[PDB]
């Protein structure tokens, strides 16, 4: 989680928002995924959110449902995802790496052992998509024992009890979905409760949405599916895929800058 602290301190001294792309590990295969991720970083990604392909991803929209299927079609396994994560960290020492997991892949061989493996490969945070704060105790405990930030979603239908729990239990960043209390109010209240810095994760597909998120008082933006749409769009030309990813991330990052 220390990587996120260091990042946000550095961005705050530059009066700068974070831009954080999401991709599915191994979409559309392992080698092209490694090149995609290096291209996202070279283009100016401040941190990464990375998904592990799962048989039954009930929490993802169609674009990510189809990324998951391509990664399965390539036969990508959790063990291969953890080999990929070690290689990414070994190349890039400071960039915060966050995982987007489903509970079964975390619980499968022991919750503690899962977070121990995260720590060994140099993961900084884990968002478990189907674990609400009400069920989070053993996940957040294992996370913290292995120096992993547990990431919580603050949804548009949050109440005061949920803002206080998310503020208390989260580390690294708060995943804000302003998909319903105003945006202003949620960001203000999270800050009042000393929450982890907020990243806006709803509908971030253009530069103007990144600037709007920073202007609203968020620490940055997560592009939850627009990066994956650019992969889906360019499967036939890997080289064009990497060029469109670089020009998209460059533009989104420029929008975060003072």
């Amino acid at each position: 989680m220390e990587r996120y602290e260091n990042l946000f301190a550095q961005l705050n001294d530059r009066r700068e928002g974070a831009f954080v792309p999401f991709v599915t590990l191994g979409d559309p295969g392992i080698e092209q995924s490694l090149k995609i991720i290096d291209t996202l970083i070279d283009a100016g990604a401040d941190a990464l959110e990375l998904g592990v392909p799962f048989s039954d991803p009930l929490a993802d929209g169609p674009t990510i449902q189809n990324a998951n299927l391509r990664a399965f079609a390539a036969g990508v396994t959790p063990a291969q995802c953890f080999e990929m994560l070690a290689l990414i960290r070994e190349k890039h020492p400071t960039i915060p790496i966050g995982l987007l997991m489903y509970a079964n892949l975390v619980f499968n061989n022991g919750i503690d052992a899962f977070y121990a493996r995260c720590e060994q490969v140099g993961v900084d945070s884990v968002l478990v998509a189907d674990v609400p704060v009400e069920e989070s105790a053993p996940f957040r405990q294992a996370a913290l024992r292995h120096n992993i930030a547990p990431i919580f979603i603050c949804p548009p239908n949050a109440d005061d009890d949920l803002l206080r729990q998310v503020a208390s239990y989260g580390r690294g960043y708060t995943y804000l979905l302003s998909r319903a209390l105003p945006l202003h109010h949620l960001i203000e209240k999270l800050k009042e409760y000393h929450a982890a810095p907020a990243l806006q994760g709803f509908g971030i597909s253009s530069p103007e949405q990144v600037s709007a998120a920073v202007r609203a008082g968020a620490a940055g933006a997560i592009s939850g599916s627009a990066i994956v749409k650019i992969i889906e769009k360019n499967l036939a030309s890997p080289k064009q895929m990497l060029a469109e990813l670089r020009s998209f991330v460059s533009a989104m990052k420029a929008a975060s800058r003072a």
Partner: peptide, 10 residues
């Protein structure tokens, strides 16, 4: 239990 995304808890 209730292993759903937070948005479905309400």
């Amino acid at each position: 239990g209730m292993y759903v995304p937070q948005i479905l808890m309400p």
